[PDB]
Amino acid sequence: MMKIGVFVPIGNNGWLISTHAPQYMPTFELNKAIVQKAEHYHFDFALSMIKLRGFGGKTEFWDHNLESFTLMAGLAAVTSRIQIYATAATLTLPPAIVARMAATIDSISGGRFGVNLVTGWQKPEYEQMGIWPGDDYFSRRYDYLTEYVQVLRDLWGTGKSDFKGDFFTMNDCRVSPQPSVPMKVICAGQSDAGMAFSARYADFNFCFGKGVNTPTAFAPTAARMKQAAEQTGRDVGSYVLFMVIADETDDAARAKWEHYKAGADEEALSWLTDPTSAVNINMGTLVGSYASVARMLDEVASVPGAEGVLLTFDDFLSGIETFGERIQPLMQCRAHLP
């Protein structure tokens, strides 16, 4: 039994850095079509990242990015069942503002909203607007995030905070209304510090899938996350990020993957710096027939600590359709759906 989410393309061209990949801008209407089709095929959740600066090149890769809370507020208004997660770049928003935005999208969605809390680590995204705290941030960022989430938990739990720390001073800070359901916090910590944060404050932790057609290769990461969760006694499972490149046959899927690699936008790859390829930021990739991808996702579901997968596709509109019509019906870990 495994949850499935869609990582919505809030940035241009999704997760392929290639002149041979589909070229598209992130629009509301594209993300609306993607999330409504994901909801139709019983995807459990939709998440958007936040990406405040791109990598340029021929494809202007991630030069064009919408903002995560406003995108997800719009998507909440045109959905009814799928869970909706926005990402907070915690250097860019005061916690009381995130608290109130989360209560707002709770109201829009009827209790289907959560927040992905990130420290940020790419200095230029912050330096460009004069808000990088300096190179001490690399080591202290989970101290900062710990204070941030304490403020969030106070406001969502009681409506008020008197929290006083190194980074925040709350003087009877108020945020009402409080969310109608317990607010879900998710984290994407890979480091020991990040997983220790997730074990204390997250409902679940996102990690990277690893390799091409080695679906269980992330297992050591999920094991580290289970060990971190033992230290708090909390049930904090792993949701694993993969790109799915599926077709009618293994050969046809491999032909598309190779076509994408052949178009690699090397100027964009420069800025960013059977093996994984920089063409999708060395993402965990599942490349095969619909049946091969279903088998490989059933293998993810068997890894200790894995509770779900977060999916990108080479083509989201056709990828979600073929996932729902051809892959998901063969998955033992989705036999619970209608």
Please report, as ranges, the residues that interact with ligand FMN according to CB under 6 A.
Answer: 49-50, 87, 89, 118-121, 188-191, 193-194, 206-208, 241, 310
Residue 205 annotated in ligand binding = no
Angle between helices 28-40 and 68-77 (to 10 degrees): 50
Is 139 or 171 the residue whose CB approaches ligand FMN more closely? 139
Please list the alpha-helical segments (H only) found in the chain.
Answer: 28-40, 68-77, 95-109, 123-127, 137-158, 192-201, 219-230, 250-262, 266-272, 290-300, 316-322
Residue 125 annotated in ligand binding = yes
Q: What whole-number distance in Å separates Cα of residue 76 and Cα of residue 84? A: 7
Residue 51 annotated in ligand binding = yes
**Smallest separation, CB 89 to ligand FMN (Å):** 6
Is 179 or 189 the residue whose CB approaches ligand FMN more closely? 189
Burial class (CB in 10 A: 0-12, 13-18, 19+), 124: exposed
DSSP state of 332: G
Q: What whole-number distance in Å separates Cα of residue 39 and Cα of residue 147? A: 35
Residue 50 annotated in ligand binding = yes
CA 184 to chain centre: 14
Q: Which two tokens stand for residue 189?
A: 């910590």
Q: What whole-number distance in Å separates Cα of residue 5 and Cα of residue 267? A: 31
For ligand FMN, which residue has the nearest CB? Answer: 194
Is 74 or 308 the residue whose CB approaches ligand FMN more closely? 308
**Smallest separation, CB 307 to ligand FMN (Å):** 14
Is 115 or 170 the residue whose CB approaches ligand FMN more closely? 115
Is 173 or 268 the residue whose CB approaches ligand FMN more closely? 268
Is 89 or 105 the residue whose CB approaches ligand FMN more closely? 89
Distances (CA, A) of 264 to 17, 65, 268, 269, 316: 6, 20, 9, 8, 19
**Smallest separation, CB 215 to ligand FMN (Å):** 16
Residue 3 annotated in ligand binding = no
**Smallest separation, CB 219 to ligand FMN (Å):** 16
**Smallest separation, CB 117 to ligand FMN (Å):** 8
Residue 141 annotated in ligand binding = yes
Is 247 or 314 the residue whose CB approaches ligand FMN more closely? 314
**Smallest separation, CB 90 to ligand FMN (Å):** 9
Half-sphere exposure of 244 (CA within 13 A, CB side): 35
Residue 171 annotated in ligand binding = no
Q: Which two tokens stand for residue 28?
A: 């509301």
Q: Which two tokens stand for residue 302?
A: 């068997």
Length of the chain: 338
**Smallest separation, CB 128 to ligand FMN (Å):** 13
Q: Write out the binding residues for FMN.
A: 50-51, 116, 125, 141-142, 191
Q: Write out the binding residues.
A: 50-51, 116, 125, 141-142, 191
